[PDB]
Amino acid sequence: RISAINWNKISDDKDLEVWNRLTSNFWLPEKVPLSNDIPAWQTLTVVEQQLTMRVFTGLTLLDTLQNVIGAPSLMPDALTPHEEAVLSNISFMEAVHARSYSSIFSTLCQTKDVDAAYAWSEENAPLQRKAQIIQQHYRGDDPLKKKIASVFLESFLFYSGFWLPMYFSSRGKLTNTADLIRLIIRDEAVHGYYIGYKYQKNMEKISLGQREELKSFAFDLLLELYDNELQYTDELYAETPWADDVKAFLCYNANKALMNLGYEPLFPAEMAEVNPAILAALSP
Amino acid sequence: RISAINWNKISDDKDLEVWNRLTSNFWLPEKVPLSNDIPAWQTLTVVEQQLTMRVFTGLTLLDTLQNVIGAPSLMPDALTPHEEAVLSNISFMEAVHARSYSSIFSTLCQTKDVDAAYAWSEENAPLQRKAQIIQQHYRGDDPLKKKIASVFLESFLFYSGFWLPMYFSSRGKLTNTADLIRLIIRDEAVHGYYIGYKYQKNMEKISLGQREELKSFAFDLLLELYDNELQYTDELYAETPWADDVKAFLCYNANKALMNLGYEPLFPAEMAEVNPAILAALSP
């Protein structure tokens, strides 16, 4: 029996707070003057241009997965009708994120190179492995594992890719593209926070034993994704000097993903130390 | 095997056209200065105020249904990945529509009266009947009937309710609320058009016999919804002089719903003649 939603009877204030944050943060890639990055794009080497297109196709895959499978898989497990509505917004904004990479490709890149990057992503084992792992949990019957997987997608699995536009930005290149990516991050960080909040809400109702099983599962999953991401990073950044920097940014974000789920960080400061210029590019 | 969406390889230009129309038309109820309708609200009679709250709770139910069940039920039947993305936007904007009625209630109405209207909608047989009929098709296994039902929801079933704010607007009352409703209509008319377009695309592939069965089904369904809507209208508008005007507006919109599916109108001009002031309020 479907009932008319009532936003003046909020059972969890967080639902309204996040509804408002996400909807007031609405944007489209057309609002970013991407074409002003053409000059900076021309100063990149062929290897750097290839890297960027490969990175971006990978991010597109993850946003597409989150739009088509991820956010919708969370809907049946919502605690409130307002959460269900927030999830529809999350799903829609994931399609906006995905669409934005095509906006970048269209402005900056040659079609032959973009198509090569799409094909490379179809064949890349580490990329397909992380897509597969997350998808498996979204298709499963355990609602708490779906939320863990979602938080790891939103707060960890994009960041090997987000590093690169932030790096270019710190060097005064592709600054409009970086503005777009910062809009994506602004969404993803709220998504990871909210879904992690809901994970913790749902955990309030389950047994002490299952809580212990899930913490242990969360740590194991993150370690496995982390290992696979190191491999993905090596294959992306091989012909650059940046792999170590990317890896430190992975550890930094891995700790945030854990904190969104309510867990202590796994990665020590010496592994998660990000160049101040990268941090400055994130929050300019 | 999920693949990264590519918006520079559009297989149907309509998908991009509608993506752009709907996303560029993004709005939120907070952008409408609803509180400026408080004075006009105070000039309405108790009977007129009750009518309005009842009308609006009914519309909220239908938007909630379309967000939670309707638009998502169409996703598995999409012809293209871009259509899937447009459907996520449609679903999200239906939640925005639903949320907007709570914005109106919060600004203008007393909570005790709003709650009475919600309860009245739970008990109203004609309202629950149209929700049930549409929901049955959304839960079925016939993708073409889902689209027919959706077009009738978007291009017909809201209009007994949309009449009232358009009427008030023609009389210089609740003009900000009417602006909000016009934003809702702007979305619904595009939704009905696009889903009707897709119905016709999908029909290109089916047998002559099934096409005949579906036309006959569409006419029967619309006649049945029409009869039920006359009853809903009688129960809403009983203590007003407006029932006949509302009914003519129903016939007018019924013909548009049919045209969105590619069919000829059923209702003759003498049944579908809408007061020019109402038409003017729709397109001011």
Using alpha carbons only, what angle is made at residue B95 by residues B94 and B101, rounded to the nearest 5 degrees? Answer: 95
Measured distance CA(B105)–CA(A8) in Å, rounded: 8
Torsion of CA A137, A140, A145, A150, to 10 degrees: 40
Find where tokens 């777009």 sit: A180
CB-facing half-sphere around the CA of A158: CA atoms within 13 A: 32
B12 annotated as a binding-site residue: no
8 Å CB contact of B96 and A23: yes
Neighbours of B158 (CB within 10 A): 22
Torsion of CA B162, B164, B168, B170, to 10 degrees: 60
List, in sequence order, the alpha helices (H) in B34-174. 38-42, 46-65, 71-74, 81-108, 111-123, 125-139, 143-152, 159-170
Q: Which of helix, strand or coil describes residue A33?
A: coil
List the 193-252 stretch of B: residues with Cβ below 8 A of A: none
Q: Which of helix, strand or coil describes residue A241?
A: coil
Q: Which of helix, strand or coil describes residue A155?
A: helix
Neighbours of B264 (CB within 10 A): 8
Least Cα distance to A178 among A154, A158, A162 occurs for A162
Name the binding residues of A for Fe cation.
63, 94, 97, 154, 188, 191
What is the dihedral sign for C-alpha A231, A233, A237, A243? Answer: negative
Cβ of B25 under 8 Å from any chain A Cβ?
Answer: no
Least Cα distance to B65 among B102, B41, B98, B21 occurs for B98
Query: Which amino acid would we find at residue A255?
Result: N
Measured distance CA(B248)–CA(A228) in Å, rounded: 64
Tokens describing residue A156: 């960890």
CB-facing half-sphere around the CA of B216: CA atoms within 13 A: 6
Q: How far is CA B267 from CA B33, B152, B282, in A?
A: 37, 15, 20
Neighbours of A238 (CB within 10 A): 10
- Nearest CB to A102; choose among B6, B94, B135: B6
Measured distance CA(A278)–CA(B231) in Å, rounded: 64
Least Cα distance to A190 among A14, A22, A15 occurs for A22
Burial (CB count <10 Å: 0-12, 13-18, 19+), residue A80: middle
| Residue B154 DSSP one-character state | I
Least Cα distance to B280 among B209, B204, B189, B175 occurs for B175
Taking the alpha carbons at both ends of chain B, their separation in whole angstroms is 48
Measured distance CA(B38)–CA(B15) in Å, rounded: 40
Neighbours of B227 (CB within 10 A): 12
- Contact between A219 and A266 under an 8 Å Cβ cutoff? The reply is yes
Residue A142: phi and psi, rounded to 5, are -105, 105
Least Cα distance to B224 among B161, B148, B162, B164 occurs for B148
Measured distance CA(A204)–CA(A170) in Å, rounded: 42
Using alpha carbons only, what angle is made at residue B233 by residues B230 and B238, rounded to the nearest 5 degrees? Answer: 125
Q: Which of helix, strand or coil describes residue A80?
A: coil
Neighbours of B245 (CB within 10 A): 18
| Residue A17 DSSP one-character state | H
Measured distance CA(A234)–CA(A43) in Å, rounded: 24
Measured distance CA(B44)–CA(A227) in Å, rounded: 67
Measured distance CA(B172)–CA(B160) in Å, rounded: 20
Find where tokens 């005064």 sit: A172
Number of residues that this document lists for chain B: 284
Tokens describing residue A105: 């490709």
Find where tokens 């609803």 sit: B34
Query: Which amino acid would we find at residue A220?
Result: D
| Residue A154 DSSP one-character state | I
Looking only at Cα atoms, what is the longest distance across chain A? 60
8 Å CB contact of A99 and B7: yes
- Contact between A79 and A201 under an 8 Å Cβ cutoff? The reply is yes
Q: Which of helix, strand or coil describes residue B270?
A: coil
Q: How far is CA B110 from CA B102, B123, B221, in A?
A: 12, 20, 37
The CATH H-level superfamily of A1-284 is Ribonucleotide Reductase, subunit A (1.10.620.20)
Q: How far is CA A95 from CA A46, A111, B83, B107, in A?
A: 29, 21, 11, 33
| Residue B131 DSSP one-character state | H
Measured distance CA(B65)–CA(A5) in Å, rounded: 10
Tokens describing residue A131: 């897509």
Using alpha carbons only, what angle is made at residue A255 by residues A249 and A258, rounded to the nearest 5 degrees? Answer: 140
What is the dihedral sign for C-alpha A65, A71, A72, A73? Answer: positive
The residues of B annotated as belonging to the active site are 101
Measured distance CA(A134)–CA(A140) in Å, rounded: 10
Using alpha carbons only, what angle is made at residue B23 by residues A162 and B155, rounded to the nearest 5 degrees? Answer: 145
Measured distance CA(B110)–CA(B105) in Å, rounded: 8
Burial (CB count <10 Å: 0-12, 13-18, 19+), residue A175: middle
Tokens describing residue B116: 């009475």
Least Cα distance to B148 among B221, B78, B44, B45 occurs for B221
Q: Interhelix angle for B159-170 vs B208-237, to 10°?
A: 50
- Contact between B50 and B117 under an 8 Å Cβ cutoff? The reply is yes
Least Cα distance to B113 among A80, A8, A10 occurs for A8
Least Cα distance to B82 among B186, B4, B185, B188 occurs for B4
Question: How is B241-257 classified by DSSP, letter by letter?
Answer: S-HHHHHHHHHHHHHHH
Measured distance CA(B66)–CA(B156) in Å, rounded: 14
Q: How far is CA A146 from CA A94, A206, B75, B257, in A?
A: 17, 15, 21, 40
CB-facing half-sphere around the CA of A163: CA atoms within 13 A: 25
Expt. technique: X-ray
- Contact between A62 and A153 under an 8 Å Cβ cutoff? The reply is yes
Neighbours of B47 (CB within 10 A): 11
Tokens describing residue B175: 């003009």
Measured distance CA(A128)–CA(A121) in Å, rounded: 8
List the 55-114 stretch of A: residues with Cβ below 8 A of B: 57-58, 60-61, 64-65, 67-69, 72, 81, 84-85, 88-89, 91-92, 94-96, 98-99, 101-103, 105-106, 111, 114
- Contact between B245 and B163 under an 8 Å Cβ cutoff? The reply is yes
List, in sequence order, the alpha helices (H) in chain A. 13-24, 38-42, 46-65, 71-74, 81-108, 111-123, 125-139, 143-152, 159-170, 175-203, 208-237, 243-261, 276-282
Tokens describing residue A32: 């970013």
Tokens describing residue B249: 């507006």
Least Cα distance to A253 among A179, A156, A140, A112 occurs for A156
Resolution of the experimental structure, in angstroms: 2.0
Measured distance CA(B8)–CA(B21) in Å, rounded: 17
Cβ of A24 under 8 Å from any chain B Cβ?
Answer: yes
Query: Which amino acid would we find at residue B130?
Result: K
